Design an enzyme around this catalytic site. Sequence first.
Site, mmCIF file in Angstrom:
data_model
loop_
_atom_site.group_PDB
_atom_site.id
_atom_site.type_symbol
_atom_site.label_atom_id
_atom_site.label_comp_id
_atom_site.label_asym_id
_atom_site.label_seq_id
_atom_site.Cartn_x
_atom_site.Cartn_y
_atom_site.Cartn_z
ATOM 1 N N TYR A 47 0.842 -1.185 0.000
ATOM 2 C CA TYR A 47 0.000 0.000 0.000
ATOM 3 C C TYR A 47 0.882 1.241 0.000
ATOM 4 C CZ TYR A 47 -3.450 3.511 1.307
ATOM 5 O OH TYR A 47 -4.258 4.624 1.337
ATOM 6 N N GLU A 83 -3.793 7.480 -4.060
ATOM 7 C CA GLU A 83 -3.783 6.206 -3.351
ATOM 8 C C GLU A 83 -3.512 5.075 -4.335
ATOM 9 O OE1 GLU A 83 -6.561 5.154 -0.092
ATOM 10 O OE2 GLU A 83 -7.459 3.777 -1.546
#
Lengths: 233, 204
Positions: free
Chosen positions: A120, A208
Amino acid sequence: MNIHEWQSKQLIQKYGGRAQSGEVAFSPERSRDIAKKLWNQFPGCEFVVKAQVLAGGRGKGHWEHGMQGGVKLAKTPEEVYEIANEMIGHKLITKQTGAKGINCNKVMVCGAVKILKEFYLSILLDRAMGCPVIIATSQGGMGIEEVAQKCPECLFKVPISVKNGPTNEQLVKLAKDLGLEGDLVQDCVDNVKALYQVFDKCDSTMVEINPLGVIETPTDEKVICCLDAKIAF
Amino acid sequence: EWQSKQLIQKYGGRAQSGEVAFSPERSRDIAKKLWNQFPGCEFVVKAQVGVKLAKTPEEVYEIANEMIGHKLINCNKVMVCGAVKILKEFYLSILLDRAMGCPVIIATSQGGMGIEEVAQKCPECLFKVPISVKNGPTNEQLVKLAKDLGLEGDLVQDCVDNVKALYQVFDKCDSTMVEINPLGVIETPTDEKVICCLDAKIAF
Ligand SMILES: Nc1ncnc2c1ncn2[C@@H]1O[C@H](COP(=O)(O)OP(=O)(O)O)[C@@H](O)[C@H]1O
Ligand SMILES: [Mg+2]
Ligand SMILES: [Mg+2]
């Protein structure tokens, strides 16, 4: 609002980042052609069909009429038509949806790639600090808000100076802390540096990447690549 | 090639047709799109009526700029093919053997050169398989030919399927020759081994 997946990956590439933007299709026939022409270049390759709807948990969700998953593997262009036909024009149910469904009017068709690691990574404008900050963790498939509440020490945070932006030492350390090594370190820096060039030069609020992966090329070269993207404004 | 390579695909065969480009700019674009589908892949540039490996769309541009409008008859178009991992090279052809008056299938495991040279230095390397134009290639014959080349698993049946589609291009086009040099065992982006026609030639 936030822009769709394949639109985000495109902007990321417009600033020199490696991302699998694939190709969008507003019809199940068009999606079949995409996979078919791709077989001319990589015959026998599998395909992945990703519903284009603004909401997370697509891989977890399912469709009303019986199909399971918002991100499904396909062996042939014909299977791509099947999956796509059940996606376009239907409603998808994920965690962010509960059960109200989101209308899917398009899908993205990308080649099936072998994934070695999933991370991530996001560039968030920490308003409380008034500066950008980089979040990351070696738990790609989990979710940012889920990991934060249960394990905020699982995250690495790096505040960014608005002047020079990322510091080469900051990025090199982040890549090293994520377990990367070798050419993937610099490659991770190149992409992550490109993410900021997308975040700053576009007046974006969040960039993101979940998951940011270490994939293999058709010739089995390891390269950092964004397998998903969300950009908020 | 584009017609043939499609004919193999038309009748149910694997063929890396790539994509044609009529200028260095076009060539650079084709390689760019492939990086949206398989990022980090390399590329192969083929000059059409020679072949150089390219690592980036800019390299493809360089190589295309050297071909289009230059030597090696004049070359005015290139074919940009994704760099695929090639495991084995095979040669395979279908011919109207006038001597035996029946279609025949020749094959060898040395698919990196013309069939002329292989025969002379190695006559054991070739495999003749006479085919009855009516009874066509029999599954028994094609399976025998597959194992004669070192294929195991799904490849053995995978070979039989492609060989059959090539005979249809030979039968349903009344063509005098259908040459596949090389016929490759290739790994897919997900490391699946499959048979593929990497180059095709159809004569009359
Ligand atoms: N091209 C691909 N090949 C193989 N697996 C893929 C590919 N693209 C995505 N995936 C996998 O599918 C999962 C679900 O896709 P993703 O875009 O993350 O959807 P979401 O996070 O909304 O569920 C990813 O976490 C990744 O593991
Ligand atoms: Mg995701
Ligand atoms: Mg591999």
